[PDB]
Amino acid sequence: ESVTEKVEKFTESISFDKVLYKQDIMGSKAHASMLAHQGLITDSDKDSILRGLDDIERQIEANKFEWRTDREDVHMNIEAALTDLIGEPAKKLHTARSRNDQVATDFRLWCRDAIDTIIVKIRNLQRALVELALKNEALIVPGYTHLQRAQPVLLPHVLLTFVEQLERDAGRYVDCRARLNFSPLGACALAGTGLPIDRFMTANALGFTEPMRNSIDAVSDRDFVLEFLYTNANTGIHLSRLGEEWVLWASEEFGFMTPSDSVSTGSSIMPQKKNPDPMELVRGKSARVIGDLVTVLTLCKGLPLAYNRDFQEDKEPMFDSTKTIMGMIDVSAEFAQNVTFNEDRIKKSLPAGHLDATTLADYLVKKGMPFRSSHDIVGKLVGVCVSGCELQNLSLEEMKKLSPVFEEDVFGFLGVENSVNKFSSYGSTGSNCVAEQLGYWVNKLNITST
Amino acid sequence: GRFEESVTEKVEKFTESISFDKVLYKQDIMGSKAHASMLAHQGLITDSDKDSILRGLDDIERQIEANKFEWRTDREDVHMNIEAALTDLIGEPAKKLHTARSRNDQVATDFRLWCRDAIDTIIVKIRNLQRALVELALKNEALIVPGYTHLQRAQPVLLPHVLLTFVEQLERDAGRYVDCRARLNFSPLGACALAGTGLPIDRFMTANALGFTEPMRNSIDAVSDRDFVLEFLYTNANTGIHLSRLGEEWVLWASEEFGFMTPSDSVSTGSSIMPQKKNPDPMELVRGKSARVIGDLVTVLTLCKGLPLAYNRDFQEDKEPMFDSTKTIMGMIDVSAEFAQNVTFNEDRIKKSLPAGHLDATTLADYLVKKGMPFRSSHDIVGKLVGVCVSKGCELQNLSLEEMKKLSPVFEEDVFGFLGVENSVNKFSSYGSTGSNCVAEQLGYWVNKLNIT
Amino acid sequence: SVTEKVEKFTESISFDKVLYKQDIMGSKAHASMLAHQGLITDSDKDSILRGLDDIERQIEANKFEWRTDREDVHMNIEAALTDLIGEPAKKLHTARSRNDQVATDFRLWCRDAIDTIIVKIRNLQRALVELALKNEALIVPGYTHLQRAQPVLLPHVLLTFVEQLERDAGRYVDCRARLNFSPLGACALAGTGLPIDRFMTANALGFTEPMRNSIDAVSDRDFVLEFLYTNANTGIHLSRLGEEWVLWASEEFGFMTPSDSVSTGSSIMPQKKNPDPMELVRGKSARVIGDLVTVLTLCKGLPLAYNRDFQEDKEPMFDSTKTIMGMIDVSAEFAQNVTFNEDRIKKSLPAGHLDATTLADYLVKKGMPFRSSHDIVGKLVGVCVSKGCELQNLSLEEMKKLSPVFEEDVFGFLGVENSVNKFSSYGSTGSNCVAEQLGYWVNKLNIT
Amino acid sequence: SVTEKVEKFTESISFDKVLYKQDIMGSKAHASMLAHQGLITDSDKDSILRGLDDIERQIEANKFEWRTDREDVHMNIEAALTDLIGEPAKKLHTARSRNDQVATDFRLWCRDAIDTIIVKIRNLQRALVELALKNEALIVPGYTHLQRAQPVLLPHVLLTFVEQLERDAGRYVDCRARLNFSPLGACALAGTGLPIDRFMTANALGFTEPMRNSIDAVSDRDFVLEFLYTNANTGIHLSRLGEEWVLWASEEFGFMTPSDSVSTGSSIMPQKKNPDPMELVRGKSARVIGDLVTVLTLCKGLPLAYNRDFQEDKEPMFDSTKTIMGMIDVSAEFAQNVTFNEDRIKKSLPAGHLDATTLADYLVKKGMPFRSSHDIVGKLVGVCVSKGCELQNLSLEEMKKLSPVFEEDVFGFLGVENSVNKFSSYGSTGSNCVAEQLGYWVNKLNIT
Ligand SMILES: [Cl-]
Ligand SMILES: [Cl-]
Ligand SMILES: [Cl-]
Ligand code: NA
Fold it and tell me: At which positions is 2-(N(omega)-L-arginino)succinate bound (chain B)?
């Protein structure tokens, strides 16, 4: 009810920013070590600060640290506790530092660590997909455009689509990481300091490439948050497409995949209904990752220099986006490990819609017919085959009524198995082409037989 | 009477893309020439057929560049417009151009090439704006202005230091453009509809001919992927956020309340009855235009969310946002650079305002820490001294040494070299600080990096 | 040149020329009020009104040259009016700013656009109701988690979308009423000391009343935000229609076949019918969301009162409106050009045991606890899966192995046709319930 | 384990526990209808109602153990009910699904939250009107392009925000009415053949009527979308208040001083007063926009009818609602903890020639055309800029040199006080006009 109370609750950040504690401690140790080296604090002050910070870290890891809203945020929580433990030397940690450059440093360190963790998770999902592909390497499914059957494809070729998507995501994560890995520490409030700090020393100690060249930039920049949010959002769109695909494959209309009981829900009344809830939720969680990105874009839009309290609002969306994408990645990996393909159902489905048509057109082109004539002939033959009706079941006599170009060899180009084997272009679904790409990924991901 | 449209005509109005995708013509022609050359090399068309296609496509490109080409809605899109015109020009050979190709791999190829060219043009414009900003900084290298937190004056800084903030922002933007360009520069051409082909094409030849690093390794990915669009959109949006902050800053500096900056008449609007009113419209519109760049990004994120594999017609909606985003960001960059070349700083107005905000307080606290006083005591002392100044109506540099010595013995006559705004600025010394020698180092770096003479 | 680059960047006539009719109406009302208040003569007023009418006729005839060197729609019209009638044209500037003129014009444009959208929505609702009536007895699955859950009637499915669109029409009506207040007479932001009459112009332009605050009048764009949101939620509904119909057109579902006039195809696979209009409907919902985000972001953090940033409010509104009108209209065309495949659907239904919940309802009615009813029916479905039959093919004696409550009347609760007939709750898929709702909609849309 | 990882990813209780009151209200109404309809005994119904009341008391006393192994609010409450009362609890779910239950509960929660927001909006409007009344005579500049344009009264500026919030309240009212339709009785998606009565439960729960389509009932989240948008537009307004007050708190403007209780500072720079609460109000508008985008994107392209994706619609709604309530309340506290720096404001006004437009009005009233009046005034203002004086310090002789229409009455139109007094159009900043609008708002808000 007090104004001070209402403002305190509105402005407190510890409820969410306590997750930065490891990075805040690392940053404060590096700062103290540098201060001592530069003669701004004593070596005994450093010794006490380092030991006291390590004690606090241990207390937090053991869940014995009481986070307090009356201490506002992670930084003041940790520093007031340090003062309680070691006395007046703790008060020297503020020398030649502001909350403004401290928070920037801590957040960049947290984002760096979170990116490292995401990359491991992506590799794990890529491995899950490639292992699923190797286990189900011979299965043929329809390939779709406009959700219409277009050509036959190998199941491993489809799964490698998602592996390639995730590789571009990993690349964006690596590039983001490098760009963010510059140290804001030593910018102080915005202008730097006249005290004899060494910003190269703290940048090195904290694993940054070098110190940021402009103190105002250092305290005002949140591009690293934006870029990480965007990179999570693109990853999330890939997983939303995997979710759409697998929810469709789990339908009875498609009938291609059966999730295990452990990754689905059901009904006692309709025991055959198996709902793929985890992948629906993966699809749905792509939305909040997009919203998290919009939050911080809108937040930064039109802000003056240098530091503004508005930046407090960049933490929660980054934490949410990160937790969400990590979950989406890991659940998709578990789902991939807990699905079986319905081989008879798939086989029964493939004869519908003449997936061999393009192979037959390629046959005619190889025999010298122009592409348009080839397409016209094949469409007429398909037109003789409206029903169950299959091109490979037509007689040669029937084909010769349309063109003398057909010969007995045609049957090696018809049916869905021959069609897959006839694709030969780089990146194609041809069996040998897919075998080459599986080999690249078994090498790159260090997949073993064990 | 009123013409009565057919269903097909009503649908065609809704689905046509030529009204916007005509802007892909150069890339579409380059892609088709590369394809035809490959077809001939692989024996799929004759060398005669290839030569007819190449010369006909070059004629068509000349016609478009002359504004003598009639774009037709009844031909749907840029690809069919060009190829139907080619068939009208050369006849039968044109009909072999589409051998071992789909619109699905063609469109993806054409759009990547367009985005690659657009990124190259944006990086050039960014460097031009960085130069404009560095030149402004050099021209005004000695000017002191406040630095702000919470829109409250916090420390004194050099104007070149503030301007280099934007140069550093733009450098990260340029880095994002370079990284985006490299990731997009792989060729979808030869994925066909989605699965590849059994016809003997050469995807490495077309990739090389078109300046791509390599062919994409997955045909389904090649026709289904629009990450390059998303990444380019995001990179534009972040650039736009930087320019929106530049806009906010310069709209504030042009106010009478700040009074720091006067735009020229060529980059402002005014009032004949209020001749001192100078509205900084260009920078207001730069700030505003950041919004549509963010909207463009959201469009394509939302478009791709939840789509099944592989190619879907929804992807046609990826073009207009990318074109809008690109045209907007290029305008925003260029206009910001023109504004930077057409502003004057109001030196007397700035100077008169600086001395009364105790902006030297942190410098005095640094003095005390240098003389061996712990931080907390340094602040205690400085806060008390500023309190005396508020009482006396004076600046810290007006206090006697005797008065300071009433709170601490450490003060000596050298303290006066640490007080006042000019001396405060001079005392910043850390790397990346506003110190005059620090800033001079950074300006030297930028002058060399941008090849400024 | 610098002036040239800035002129190109700041020009708005390339997009804002679409406000011409509203700009002219607003200037006519302004001139009429100036004469009524004695600030201009009736002769000057008459010259202005006739000149503006002449210009409107020129624009409608495609004989008016829009000029970038006259910046925007307002200066293009007024400079042309000066050329046409001379000094009286200049009197329009009396007691007016571009700040209040543009806000007035844009509200009028939005009001007219919303009126058009409501007409289009009703047309699409009729198209859906007509498709429902043509297929009123068709049973299809109802889905949860993209799994078959219950049997439903196709008209019940289509009425989902009609009810969605009714909410959208309601938002349009509410939005229109809230924007229908006049900003004209706010001038630059503070009003005027000249003896204008803002009640007269408000009435003349069909507004409910003048806005009560001049700063608000020039600084407000909520009508744009609300209209953009309303368009975005309508687009969401159409994106779900698009998803459903792209699924239904798939071979895997096989529920419907679009006509050749509303699909794209393949010489080589003449059965490959792509539903491109409905995919593009789905995809266009994205730009309508992005247009909303644009104007939200534009307004966020702006100081009062008028700022040049507001020039950016027009393009997104025009885009959003053009887009949603297109989506609505093409969805109606698609609805008129689809044929269901009853044979395929009907043959797919028996394996799904969609009558299971109806059998559970039978047992609940006979006094069995619901949880027990579900377990027992699930066991019977298991028996059916094992025997390869439907529930209706089990003997009564087989059911009695699980409970004595089953009696010969059970067979009237089994099979999909019986199941649909047994739904009876208000708003349910039951045949009579759906017939009631169709009757409601036929009357409400004046279908003959 | 796998089961464990899925359980954690899919559990909703950590956030959806906040629906408990609505869940219990809905369940009691459902049980009451079941008993009236003969589906459960009256004794079973009485046991359920008493047990639900008991559980509500436990929750309100912080004695209820929420469990992730019971997934969500519905199962948490109902498994607890079964532990408390036994078998009768297991009849509660007769003729109901979680699909219609959750839609009902969320609508009720939204209806309550909207009611709470409207109260908080009215409180902020009163705070603003009270601030306006205390400072009713204060003149400040009005701005276009962040350049001083005309003199206005501080109450007129604050009434801008009150009018903005009135449109917000209108949107909240309209959104509440549209959401106030009952989905209960749609069951999984198709309704039921059990003899429920949906009108009875709609009545009991305060809904206008039952939703007319069961598939719509389980698949619709437009009420979330509309509530999220309405929060986002309110947040826009507050972000502009935030921008304005952070500017006014600057030393460059120097208009406003926040109290220590609503600001932060520096012990070494004791006149530095950071307006953190209003900066955070401005910044929190962003997450409200992001919450909207989340649910728009979630709904885009989703098939019918119920999908697990919808679990993601709660967190954004709860966040958006908590955020906007805080933004509203903190803005109201800030309004009660600011003082205007009257000498600083007064000293800044004369140099701007803010009376120029009032002088132009004077000349138009005396019969000069618009452009001539501006030509004359601009010349005079130029003279004053040279001489460093105000228009009101010019001699009538030197004015008459420029035009004979000037007379001694001109001085009553010069200077900022007279300029403000001379505005007369409805909604203008004129003293009498603003007094009228303040009176209107004092009555409307029941201020005593
Ligand atoms: Cl009036
Ligand atoms: Cl009754
Ligand atoms: Cl009922
Ligand atoms: Na506008």
Answer: 17, 104, 149, 279, 311, 316, 319
